[PDB]
Nucleic acid binder design. Structure first.
Lengths: 177, 137, 113, 84, 49, 61
RNA sequence: AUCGUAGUCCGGAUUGGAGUCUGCAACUCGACUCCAUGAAGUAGGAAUCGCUAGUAAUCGCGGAUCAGAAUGCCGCGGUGAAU
RNA sequence: UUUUUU
RNA sequence: UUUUUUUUUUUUUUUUUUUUUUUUUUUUUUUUUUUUUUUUUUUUUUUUUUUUUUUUUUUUUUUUUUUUUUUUACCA
RNA sequence: GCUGACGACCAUAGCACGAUGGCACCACCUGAUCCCUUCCCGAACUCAGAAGUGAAACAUCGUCGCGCCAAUGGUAGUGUGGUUUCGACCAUGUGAGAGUAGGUCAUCGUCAGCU
RNA sequence: CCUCCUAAAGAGUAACGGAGGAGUACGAAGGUGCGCUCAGAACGGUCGGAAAUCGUUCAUAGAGUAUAAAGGCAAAAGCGCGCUUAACUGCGAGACCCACAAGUCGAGCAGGUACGAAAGUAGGUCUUAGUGAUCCGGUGGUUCUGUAUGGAAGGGCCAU
RNA sequence: CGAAAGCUAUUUAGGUAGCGCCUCGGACGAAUACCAUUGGGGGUAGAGCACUGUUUCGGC
């Protein structure tokens, strides 16, 4: 990952000088990146989930895992332990490569993309963004496709504060505002 | 006609009303109170009658507090029914009153008229009553 | 996490204390590894061996070889302290690697468990 | 029966007694195998010298004297058999 | 649940007896039970009680 | 990383041809052609856009 | 020449923008032009209508009314059946 | 074969 | 009173097995007719008596009340 | 003096807030070849290590904000004997709960290491 | 038959007293080793909301426990994974309970195992309901008997 | 000398049986009772709202 080798040389010290931190262990870093896909309409066809798992595999470069229903809800017609989503978690080299790819290649491919909301942090430095169409990732090809799916990209960082989280995200080149 | 909302059990054991009212024996809400000197059951009909009397006498110019709530279901056997065959149905709700208990308090009104409103209310109640003022200790 | 490690050590600690035998407790850190033999009462250390010993303090501790040396040494100390039968206490560490090496050194150098 | 009041409410069931509770109290002599507590769940926990059966019966594992104590971080009631 | 024998394959005539849900287990079961006639653990096969 | 349960993950030379900027990054994509960078010949993937190229009346009449 | 059976290079409603004319005046409420959008519609239930030959069917072109405003009305010819 | 009324 | 039977669309009736609401007659709009019938096309239409309760989900499972039918309510 | 392991005890030991600690130790930490891990993930587990930091965690110290503990006195109840208007009362023996004054930022044991 | 209360702080204790359940389930929902921690709330996030899946922060349990209730449950008794058959055979010091007949708990010993690196743990399941004597008859075993003798029939003993 | 009108079971309920209670004989001999001091477990009377409910007033 080139972004990890760039953060370990330039971005860390730049973030420290920016936030005015008196200790190098205070500057934030991204701990993990989690890609999720709610396929709640599954357990009735169980082919939508197959396609979602394939899309997650191609997008992330890592075999994902099927997430079951933690409770039974009649309104969503779901019973316990029913496969209703897909998730993958990327750490270290895999997450740095994925985030570099997402910022460079894939994030300009969002249709009518003005920017990403800067108030979308949860309040502890972690960011979450939604991708309404999984074709913005070049890994998935337009010829063979099940349908148009979406995905959550949650960036979990070591920042404890909103402002530190967005400073760390913006140091990487994240498209904000 | 006060009555509990949903309750846990339909019917209750008789129990024993014994002891003094060490709790609820102080004018804690208004300035002026009607206190029980004897013990008994305060039926919900009696509560409502003594509340309507007090309200009609104070005439939307003062405030009344009721410190008794009928939460004890009292069963009765119907006429011409032999002993046994289960416990009778609930017919009314009482509060257990011990000597010392506040029953009603009044605030925001002349002492003379509050005295006579509580005196009118005591006539509907199955208790020897005294009329007390709110104290500091 | 030490809280989780002590949460997964407690079952073995309590079963050993019910058995009422001398127990060989281990404790490894990313730098050192310690071993001590506690009495059935639970509050007396009657033998110990760590990588803070002068023989292997100035050496490549934090290793499977250092764990083996510590196990070999506590086996001798238990042997010349009257202790032959202990119950092994991995202290919530997986029985593997450094802890396994220490246990095998102790088991091969006289202590029988 | 004039007011329609008396009617069906059928509950005249109850199970047989189970004879639970403390069998041997604190300070008493006890021989191994003697039952100390019959209980539902661990109202009392087995300390040193006493075992627990499949129905949470506490019994003496050895001879001695029965001791009750509250101990541990959960403030649990414990029964012990001390070699006295 | 219907009752069934688990009969030793050792030919001793020894059996254990148990119950079974024959809608969820539609095939003969076989466990390793102790045979007291040969003082050995052998395979006990399901039979008709 | 568990062995042989993950997809093929190899370095890919993405290239924004509008600004002619390269992005060397491991990815799951399988490109048809392969173009040589300063190092070896990586699977080459053209890009239409990337992070380098993406961004009174009464008086007049 | 092309499109090659697709809600499409079918269909052109509706909407956004910019204009031209007529007229004192185009908001209610004009007709056209241009660019963009691209709706229903894939042949239509019970039922029901016109037509016997230059007819039906289809294709354009004129006129009255009229400053402007026909898919209506009144006409004209072209191709041209089946029974 | 099955057509009531005004 | 008691024991059984139940209560669902406008009506009269079907469900139901915890994963849903039904014919028929209506009613509304069409169509045929000089016009109404009849007839033919379309449609709409259920707190499943109420009330606690269980369940992820109840018209359905438990409990209560309330209408309905029945069948009983005897000996001095 | 401090640190770590294992215990006693199980809030007067807790929570909250603030300060101090990196020579040993501990903790983060670096890497993932190897052992071993992940229904995906070196997150945790594991291994191989010391570039950095005491940031977090942890340990210690400080306090009364919360918690927790808590008298004395009185009251309620109560065994026995007596009386009673059945509420209770008397003699004797016991005696709460709640509340109040107040206390508390624990106290110890074994072993190892740095000073 | 089980759970709570009545039931008067050991046990027990009645009524056509007040409230509920049972007449099963499961070869894993048993054994072991290893590992894990719930419900809810708030914040952020594609469809996606009050509520699906994802991330964060609080959270001794406000969850779960096959089922009624009570008592229990962090060494979890709750939740996963691997291997397994101890849901073993012979028994059992000693106790609970008890008119009897029954019922309950049980360390330990021998044999054969299952899991664990091992100390060990395991004689079903968090427990307390899921049950029915004898007679009679059937079945799988067994040298015990075998009406003159040898067999056999029939009977006995063990299991069902 | 001296009860019982209890428990359990019962086609039982006004019968009967085992146990309890009475008597007689034998064995045993303080192992029994009372009181003082002392080791225990409890969830009752009282009390209380921390849980399950229920209740009134005020603020929100």
């Amino acid at each position: 990952a080139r972004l990890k080798a760039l953060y370990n040389n330039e971005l860390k010290q730049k973030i420290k000088e920016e936030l005015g931190l008196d200790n190098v262990m205070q500057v934030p870093k991204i701990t993990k990146i989690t890609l999720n896909m709610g396929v709640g309409g599954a357990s009735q066809d169980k082919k939508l989930l197959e396609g979602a798992v394939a899309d997650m595999t191609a997008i992330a470069g890592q075999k994902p895992v099927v997430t079951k229903a933690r409770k039974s809800i009649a309104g969503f017609k779901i019973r316990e332990e029913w496969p209703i989503g897909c998730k993958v978690t990327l750490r270290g080299e895999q997450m740095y490569e994925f985030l570099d790819r997402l910022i460079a290649v894939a994030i300009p491919r969002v249709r009518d993309f003005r920017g990403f909301s800067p108030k979308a942090f949860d309040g502890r430095g972690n960011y979450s963004l939604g991708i309404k169409e999984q074709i913005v990732f070049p890994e998935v090809d337009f010829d063979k496709i099940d349908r148009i799916r979406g995905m959550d990209v949650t960036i979990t960082t070591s920042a404890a504060t909103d402002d530190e989280g967005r400073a760390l995200l913006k140091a990487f080149g994240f498209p904000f505002k | 006609m006060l009555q509990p909302k949903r309750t846990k059990f339909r019917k209750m054991h008789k129990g024993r009303n014994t002891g003094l009212a060490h709790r609820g024996s102080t004018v804690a809400f208004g300035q002026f109170g009607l206190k029980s000197l004897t013990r008994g059951r305060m039926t919900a009909r009696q509560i409502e009658a003594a509340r309507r009397t007090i309200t009609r006498k104070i005439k939307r110019g003062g405030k009344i507090w009721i410190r008794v709530f009928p939460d004890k279901p009292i069963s009765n056997k119907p006429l011409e029914v032999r002993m046994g065959k289960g416990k009778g149905p609930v017919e009314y709700w009482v509060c257990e009153i011990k000597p010392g208990k506040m029953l009603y308090e009044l605030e925001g009104i002349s002492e003379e008229l509050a005295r006579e409103a509580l005196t009118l209310a005591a006539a509907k109640l199955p208790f020897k009553t005294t009329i007390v003022k709110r104290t500091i200790m | 996490k030490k809280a989780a490690r002590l949460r997964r050590a407690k079952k073995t600690r309590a079963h050993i204390r019910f058995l009422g035998v001398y127990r060989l407790t281990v404790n490894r850190t990313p730098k050192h590894i310690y071993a001590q033999i506690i009495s059935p009462n639970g509050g007396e250390v009657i033998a110990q061996a760590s990588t803070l010993d002068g023989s292997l303090r100035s050496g490549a501790t934090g290793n499977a070889d250092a764990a083996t040396s510590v196990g070999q040494l506590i086996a001798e100390r238990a042997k010349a302290a009257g202790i032959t039968k202990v119950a092994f206490d991995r202290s919530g560490f997986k029985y593997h690697g450094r802890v396994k090496a220490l246990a095998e050194a102790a088991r091969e150098n006289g202590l029988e468990f | 029966a004039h007011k329609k009041a008396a009617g069906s409410s059928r509950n005249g069931r109850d199970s047989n007694p189970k004879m639970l509770g403390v069998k041997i109290f604190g300070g008493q002599a006890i021989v191994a195998g003697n039952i100390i507590v019959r209980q539902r769940g661990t109202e009392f926990h087995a300390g040193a010298g006493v075992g627990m059966g499949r129905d949470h019966t506490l019994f003496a594992l050895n001879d001695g004297v029965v001791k009750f104590a509250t101990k541990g971080k959960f403030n649990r009631r414990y029964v012990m058999v001390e070699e006295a | 649940r219907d009752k069934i024998k688990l009969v030793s394959t050792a030919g001793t005539g020894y059996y254990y007896t148990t119950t079974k849900n024959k809608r969820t287990m539609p095939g003969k079961m076989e466990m390793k039970k102790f045979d007291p006639k040969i003082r050995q653990h052998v395979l006990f096969k399901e039979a008709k009680i | 990383m568990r062995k042989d349960i993950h997809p093929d993950y190899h370095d890919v030379l993405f290239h924004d041809t509008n600004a002619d900027v390269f992005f060397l990054t491991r990815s799951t994509v399988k490109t048809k052609t392969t173009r040589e960078y300063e190092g070896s010949e990586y699977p080459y993937y053209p890009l239409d856009i990337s992070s380098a190229s993406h961004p009174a009346s009464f008086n007049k009449r």
